[PDB]
């Protein structure tokens, strides 16, 4: 649950992402894959990537980064009223991709890391607080659907 002022911070930060969605999406996935190499094994189309240089050179990884952040941005713009947008993603990630909630924690922290890396000194403590709360809400509502499905 976020206040109006917190949502305003989230959507202000998101403007930074929308200026370069592919570059942000690429770096988020690279941070996930290099920090948590077990996550790469869930992607049949990226498991061939052995080095970060190959990851950086992969145009399909940048494409998928655009898909991921476009979906997340659509959810964030609903300011919590995201049941219709979130349900299909919860279902596909639990039942088809088999993504444990832990990996959603990993990618949430990766987003925070990338924002500081690309905007050092321009991602203030209030903005980090609000973005963190928004990603916690996203993860918590996914977790509720995971529990319904019995997925661990
Ligand atoms: C912010 C969190 C995430 C968002 C918004 C997101 C979004 C998406 C979307 C929109 C798709 C394509 C449609 C679909 O299959 O539902 C997708 C596919 C997929 N996601 Fe995610 N995802 C997220 C996190 C993760 C994480 C953490 C993992 C694994 C560590 C993951 C694994 C996958 C896989 C394996 C696919 C299929 C890729 C393919 O072969 O095309 N997702 N995701």
From Swiss-Prot:
Nitrite binds at residue 64. Keywords: Cytoplasm, Heme, Iron, Metal-binding, Muscle protein, Oxidoreductase, Oxygen transport, Phosphoprotein, Transport. It is an enzyme of class 1 (oxidoreductase). InterPro entries: Globin, Globin-like_sf, Myoglobin. PROSITE patterns: GLOBIN. One of its GO terms (biological process) is removal of superoxide radicals. The keyword Translocase does not apply. Its main location: cytoplasm. Its EC number is 1.7.-.-, 1.11.1.-. O2 binds at residue 64. It is found in: Cytoplasm, Sarcoplasm. Heme b binds at residue 93. One of its GO terms (molecular function) is metal ion binding. It catalyses: Fe(III)-heme b-[protein] + nitric oxide + H2O = Fe(II)-heme b-[protein] + nitrite + 2 H(+); H2O2 + AH2 = A + 2 H2O. Pfam families: Globin (PF00042). The modification Phosphoserine is found at residue 3. One of its GO terms (cellular component) is sarcoplasm. Residues 1-147 form the Globin domain. Monomeric. Belongs to the globin family. Monomeric heme protein which primary function is to store oxygen and facilitate its diffusion within muscle tissues. Reversibly binds oxygen through a pentacoordinated heme iron and enables its timely and efficient release as needed during periods of heightened demand. Depending on the oxidative conditions of tissues and cells, and in addition to its ability to bind oxygen, it also has a nitrite reductase activity whereby it regulates the production of bioactive nitric oxide. This is Myoglobin. It comes from Equus caballus.
């Amino acid at each position: 649950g976020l206040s109006d002022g917190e949502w305003q911070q989230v959507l202000n930060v998101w403007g930074k992402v929308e200026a370069d969605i592919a570059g942000h999406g690429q770096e988020v996935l690279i941070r996930l894959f290099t920090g948590h190499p077990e996550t790469l094994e869930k992607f049949d189309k990226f498991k061939h990537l052995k080095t970060e240089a190959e990851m950086k050179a992969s145009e399909d990884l940048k494409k998928h980064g655009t898909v991921v952040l476009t979906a997340l941005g659509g959810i964030l713009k609903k300011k919590g009223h995201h049941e219709a947008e979130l349900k299909p993603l919860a279902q596909s990630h639990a039942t088809k991709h088999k993504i444990p909630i832990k990996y959603l924690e990993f990618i949430s922290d990766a987003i925070i890391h990338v924002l500081h890396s690309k905007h050092p000194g321009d991602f203030g403590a209030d903005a980090q607080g609000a973005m963190t709360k928004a990603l916690e809400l996203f993860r918590n509502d996914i977790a509720a659907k995971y529990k319904e499905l019995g997925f661990q």
